[PDB]
Every structure is written in C-alpha cells, then in structure tokens.
C-alpha cells in the first residue's frame, strides 16, 4: 500500500509525480509510520544502489509537493527525529544513509525547532570526523545546512586536510563564500585532484558576483594558476570564467578588464589571459580595430593588447589580421612620440611599459622595407646616443638594433660608435650605462670572428678598468661584461678561470653567483675538455654552493648549474648525482622551494632520458639513501624515507623511460636487478635495526622483468648467497622477503 507506492518508485523517476498524487491520498492516516518503515529499509541497502537514491529522490520530491499544499502536516520534524538516532551506528552505511537522508530532507525547508537544531548540530559535528570517507562526504552536506564559526571552522579544516578528494569537493561546494573562507577555496585551485581544481573556477567563484571583490593580487594569482593548469579541463574552466563571467563584470570591455589586472606589474599573466580569452572568443579577435587614434592615445593596457594581438596573429598565421598592425615607419613614429612622455615623471612608468610593447612588436616584424628599416635604425641609434633610457629598455633597444643591422660586424661597429659617444659625454651613472651597453653587445653576438679589434677595445677601454675599479657596482658590472667575452673565446675563458675561482672564495654572495654562472657557461659553451686542469676547483665551488642552505639563491644556483652540466655535458654525473639527491631530500633544504623546483624538473628529465642515466642512479642509490637515513634520525622519520625510496625506485624503473636507433638493446642489464646486487653488497655496512631491515624492504618493491637472460638471475642469486653467508640475524618479515625474492629468481631462470 503506502509502502508499496514507495517500492514502486524504486525503478524509475518518471512516475514520481503520479505516485505523489496517490500517496497524497493517504495523508490522513499509518502514514508517518509507513514512511519511516520505508527508510528503515533504506538504511540496510549498501551504497552503490541506484534504487535507494531513486526512492530517496521520490521522498524529497513528495515532501516539497506536500508543503504546496497542506503544510498542516509537519513530517520533516518526525522523520529527522527518527533518523538522527542512527548517527551513532556501527554499519557504516546506516551512518552513511542517515547522513544522506538528513542532508536531503532538511534542505526541503528552513523552519526547524531549535531543540531539533541544536541536537542535529551536535551529533553532526562529530560525524564529519567519521572513520569512513562516505560518511564524511554526506555529513558535511547535511551539516552545511545549519551554517551560521565553529560550524564554519570545521569545514575549512576538512577542506584543507581531508585525505579524500570527494570529501574536500563536497566541502568546497557547500561552504560559505566570504573573505574569511575565501583564502582556503583559492588554495584548492592547486588541489591534487583535477575535478576539485575545476570546481573552483566552474562553480565556486561564479558564486562571487563580481571579480572586483577580489584583491588585484588575488585576481592575478587565480588566472596564473587556472590558465597554466596541467589539466585540459581545469584550464578550460578558468578560461571560460575569464571569457564569459569576468568580461561581463567589465562591461564587455576587454580594456576595462585589463585595467583591473595591473598589467605593468603582471605582464606575463596579462598576456596569457588575453591569448586565452581569444582562444575562447575567436570571433572577437576579428573585431579589434587599431586606427591612428589608437596609437596616439596609447595606454599600458592598450599597448599590451596590440602587442599580444600581433603575437597571436603571427603564431596563428592570421595574415589578413596582421595588416591592421602598423608599418615600421609608423611604428618608429609611435615610439618617438612616446619618448616625449618620458620627460614628464607622472607618465614615466607607463611610457616605459608602452615603449616596451612597441619594441616587442618591432622585434616581431621581418621588415623587407629597407626605407623603414633605415628609419628605425636611425631612431634607435639616436635614442641610445643621446637619451637616458632605463636598464629595462636598454636591452630591447640593443636587441632590436641587432635585428636591423645586416650582420654582427655592422652591429659591433655601430654599437661601439654609440658606446664611444656616450663615453665622451661623461668625460658613475655614465660608466654604468656604458657597461650596460657593453653587456648587451656581447649578449647579441655568437662568435668572435671579425671582431677581435672591437673586443680588445672594449676590454682595454671599459671592462678591465671596471674590473679593477674600487667602486663596488662598477666592479660587479665589469665582471658580468668580462664573462660574456669569455663565452666568445675559449683561450680567454681559460685564462680567466683563476679569477672567477678567486671571486667565489673571497667574494660576496653576489660575486659567488657570478662565478657559478660564468664557470658553468664556459663549460657548456667551450666544452668539458678545455678546463680539465680546473676540474676539481670548479666541482669544489659547485659542491660548496649546493651545501649553503643559508643562501636560498646561491644554493638554488649551484643546484641548477649541476643539473645542466649533467644533462648537457655529462659532467662527472657519478660524483654529483649523490650529493644532488641528498640535498634535494635533505630537511635543512626543505624550505628552499626554488631548489626543489629545479631538481623537481631535473631528476625526471635526467633519469627518464636514457637507460644509462637510470644505471648511474642505481649505482649510488644505496649510499645516498643510507646517508639520508643518518640525517633523518636527527617529525616522522620512517614514513618520509619510504616516500624518498619509492621516488628513487621510480627514477630507476626501466618502464618509465620516455623512449624515442639501438639494434643492441639485447644484453642491457636491468637497472633494478643491478640495484638488487647493490643492496646485497651494502647490507653488511648497514646497521642492524630498521636500517638493515629497510634496505631489505626494497627488494620486495623492485620491478624485475621475467624475460631477462638466466645468467642475470644466476648472478643476483650469487649476490644473495654471499650476503646470506654473513649469517646476520634477521626477523621474520626480512627472512620472508629474502625467501620470496630468492624463489622469484629460481622461477625466472626456469621459464
């Protein structure tokens, strides 16, 4: 009857309206009782049942249908009183169904009796800490119906620390949105689960009416994460929020939106946002117009838009769209108008940004227009000779100059003439500007052919005098200039290695960083064999740098230098691979996130690039891991080591090679079976206890293929036996791992 109506809603949802009417004929009765009887049978069904949700969907549907009309019958209060008793239960599903039901039923109306309010709150607050994840999920949904502090603070706590992604998402989807709760939902934009990240852009942020409510630094941090996200869906959700919601708050005026991003201080994010907006809204790209008026009233946002539009069309090859960008003749004119604005300080910072954008547009052009090429060259030749551009624009000016010159020789000739004229004027600020021109000169040439005389000149006239100057800024700038000249001549590089070694030991941190970059670049540029006389001295400073956890910048630099020397040159990999792994996992360096970022990228690239790189890691694996054990004993010690070891094991797994001619892969020895041999030979030097126990634990995690030659399995068993002959005392699990490993070897020989 009344219960069988419910049992009939089991199959489908279409008839729910029909059954609501018939059941609405039996209101005046064992009404209440029969429903609770139906729910008592919903507590027995385990999760995963399409029905239980259908039945429960039918009930929430009928309740609402009942409040409209004949609200005389208050059935939400009895049903909640009956089911709250089960919040404390041992069948996790009785708890999960109870929370499931309460969450949906309470949502059917707001007016509740206070005693029903308090009791439900007290019991639910304990539930959201349930041992099962499914209970927590439905509990926060139920609890979130009694929001408004203590209520709220608990949701922030699970959202932030709950180990289950589905739970976090449920909290993320029902928590209140306010400046107090805002910082934590934005953190989820970097959640490990893609769906949780996508939820922040797709559902949670739209709840905020306007993006202006956020601080400018919040707006930028959002787009930086969203538009660069690794997952195609999260990245799409962030681009849609930017291209359909945020553009709306800015009156559908892209410029007005750009003005709310402080583009001059957030250039990289602002460019990406523009590009992503037009990936979503390609129709708008063809609607931008750049009349003469546009270029005479340029702004920071207006100029960035043109530079990005030009950047897109070139990449996308939208040739007809590029016809809207000006010719170099007009561009040279637009730049020169902007120079005038540099005289007035109130418009100085913006004009530097505008000029920057125009130079980028100019660097993009392939100007067959000799006429306009000559004009822009004159303008640049003049601006560098007479004006006092900031260090920021100097580089782009000299870079664009190189692009216009017919060859490196004409570029050196011209730029030396400019440097000499600027040098005559001053005869501090003047000399530093000259050296900045010298620095950009040697940054834009690649070989020393045909420019010996220009070099010997810059050396005698500026660089050496600067290197010997007692004024600290000039000396530092002179050394950077000297370094770039060493990258053009190997013999000069070799002649100055002693100087840059003297810079590291007796110099400041700034000078140590100059030495690391210089010596590293001389090796990469000129080759490894040229400097073998200084091999130990250079490696020394690379070691010392990597161990200075006091200087995050210097430490990160040594780590980076080693990384590129290994990948590019294979520069004593064996010697550095172990100190690198130790420092990378060392606790004293954990706070240095810059270092963990470069090595976070290097190890996968190095390990997974070649079979020989995985072999080198297994060769020092044990010694690196043992060194970390000693370091770690001095919060949880055993748990972190396990994650470290599994990382090193993944690096050495042959299956994880990226892979890309090798006819003789035949007798390549398996790195993991080679690592087993390493472990057997190192167990004696381990200290009995967790250490020797832990090293044996790794034998069970190894990935040994079953198609290797028999002599390989035979060789490792010999290693196994040699270790067994020591007669060390081992616990049960150790002996079980060794026995299971020894039998695996036999089985793979047999096959």
């Amino acid at each position: 009857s009344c219960i069988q109506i419910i049992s009939s809603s089991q199959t489908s949802i279409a008839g729910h309206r029909k059954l609501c009417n018939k059941l609405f004929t039996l209101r005046t009765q064992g009404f209440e009782t029969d429903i609770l009887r139906a729910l008592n049978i919903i507590l027995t069904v385990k999760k995963g049942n399409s029905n239980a949700d259908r039945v429960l969907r039918f009930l929430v549907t009928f309740v609402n249908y009942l409040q409209q009309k004949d609200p005389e019958i208050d059935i939400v209060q009895p049903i909640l009183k009956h089911i709250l008793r089960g919040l404390d239960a041992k069948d996790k599903t009785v708890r999960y169904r109870c929370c499931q039901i309460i969450a949906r039923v309470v949502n059917c109306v707001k007016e509740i009796d206070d005693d029903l309010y308090n009791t439900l709150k007290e019991k639910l607050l304990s539930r959201v800490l349930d041992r099962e994840s499914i209970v927590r999920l439905e509990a926060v949904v139920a609890l979130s119906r009694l929001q408004e502090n203590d209520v709220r603070n608990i949701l922030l706590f699970l959202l932030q620390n709950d180990p289950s992604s589905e739970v976090r998402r449920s909290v993320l989807l029902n928590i209140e949105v306010s400046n107090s709760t805002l910082p934590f939902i934005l953190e989820r934009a970097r959640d490990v689960d893609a769906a949780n990240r996508k939820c922040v852009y797709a559902r949670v942020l739209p709840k905020i009416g306007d993006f202006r409510y956020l601080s400018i630094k919040k707006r930028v941090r959002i787009l930086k994460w969203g538009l660069n996200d690794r997952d195609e869906s999260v990245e799409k959700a962030a681009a849609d929020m930017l291209a359909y919601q945020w553009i709306e708050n800015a009156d559908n005026n892209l410029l007005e939106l750009l003005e709310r991003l402080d583009v001059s201080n957030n250039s990289d994010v602002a460019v990406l946002a523009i590009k992503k907006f037009f990936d979503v809204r390609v129709d708008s790209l063809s609607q931008l117009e750049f009349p003469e008026q546009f270029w005479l009233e340029l702004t920071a946002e207006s100029s960035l838009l043109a530079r990005t539009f030009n950047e897109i069309c070139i990449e996308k090859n939208y040739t007809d769209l590029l016809d809207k960008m000006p010719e170099v003749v007009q561009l040279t004119y637009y730049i020169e108008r902007q120079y005038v604005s540099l005289r007035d300080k109130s418009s100085y910072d913006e004009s530097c940004f505008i000029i920057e954008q125009l130079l980028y547009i100019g660097l993009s052009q392939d100007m067959v227009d000799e006429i306009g090429r000559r004009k822009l060259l004159k303008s640049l030749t003049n601006s560098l000779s007479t004006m006092a551009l900031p260090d920021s624009l100097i580089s782009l000016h000299i870079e664009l100059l190189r692009k216009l010159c017919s060859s490196e020789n004409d570029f050196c000739s011209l730029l030396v003439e400019i440097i000499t004229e600027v040098f005559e004027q001053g005869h501090a600020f003047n000399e530093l500007r000259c050296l900045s021109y010298v620095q950009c000169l040697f940054e834009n040439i690649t070989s020393s052919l045909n420019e010996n005389l220009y070099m010997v000149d810059m050396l005698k006239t500026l660089i050496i005098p600067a290197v010997r100057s007692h004024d600290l800024p000039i000396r530092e700038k002179g050394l950077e200039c000297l370094s770039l000249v060493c990258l053009l001549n190997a013999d000069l590089a070799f002649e100055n290695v002693p100087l840059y070694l003297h810079c590291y030991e007796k110099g400041s941190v700034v000078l140590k960083c100059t030495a690391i970059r210089t010596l590293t670049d001389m090796l990469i540029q000129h080759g490894k064999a040229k400097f073998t006389e200084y091999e130990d001295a250079i490696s020394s400073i690379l070691f010392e740098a990597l161990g200075e956890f006091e200087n995050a910048e210097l430490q990160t630099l040594g780590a980076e230098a080693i990384a590129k020397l290994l990948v590019i040159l294979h520069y004593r990999d064996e010697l550095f691979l172990k100190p690198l792994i130790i420092q990378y996992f060392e606790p004293n360096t954990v706070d240095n996130h810059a270092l963990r970022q470069v090595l976070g990228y290097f190890f996968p690239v190095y390990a997974f690039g070649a079979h020989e790189n995985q072999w080198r890691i297994a060769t020092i694996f044990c010694d690196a891991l043992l060194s970390l054990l000693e370091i770690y004993r001095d919060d949880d010690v055993q748990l972190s080591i396990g994650h470290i070891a599994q990382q090193m094991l993944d690096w050495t797994d042959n299956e994880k090679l990226y892979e890309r001619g090798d006819d003789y892969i035949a007798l390549n020895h398996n790195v993991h079976l080679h690592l087993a041999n390493m472990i057997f030979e190192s167990l004696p030097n381990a200290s009995e206890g967790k250490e020797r126990k832990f090293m044996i634990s790794l034998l069970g995690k190894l990935k040994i293929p079953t198609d290797l030659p028999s002599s390989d399995y035979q060789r490792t068993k010999r290693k196994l036996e040699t270790y067994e002959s020591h007669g060390f005392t081992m616990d049960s699990t150790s002996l079980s791992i060794l026995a299971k490993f020894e039998r695996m070897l036999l089985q793979n020989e047999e096959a």
Binding site: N40, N49, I516, V598
Partner: protein, 52 residues
C-alpha cells in the same frame, strides 16, 4: 533494467539493532608540487645568454 538492484520493502527489520551504538594520519596537505614556476626552457639555456 537488466540489473535488478533490487529492494524488497516488505522485509522485517529490527530498528534497535541497527541503532545500537574520529580516526592520527590526517603532510603534503593534498596540493600539487611546485613545478609551474621553473621554465623548463631554462635548463638548456646559458645563464648569461638566455636568448642564445
């Protein structure tokens, strides 16, 4: 559907029995590694001549 779930709502149930009356692992607080900052292009660039 072919997959009968399937529920018999006339079965006998004992309410008191079902109603008969926290968890501390709870580190790496579910956030991606910092890896978007390092421009992978830096590795194969010279420190002093990035646009090489």
């Amino acid at each position: 559907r072919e997959l009968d779930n399937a529920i018999d709502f006339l079965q006998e149930v004992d309410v008191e029995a079902l109603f008969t009356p926290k968890l501390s692992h709870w580190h790496n607080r579910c956030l991606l590694p910092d890896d978007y900052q390092y421009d992978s292009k830096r590795l194969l660039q010279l420190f002093l001549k990035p646009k090489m």
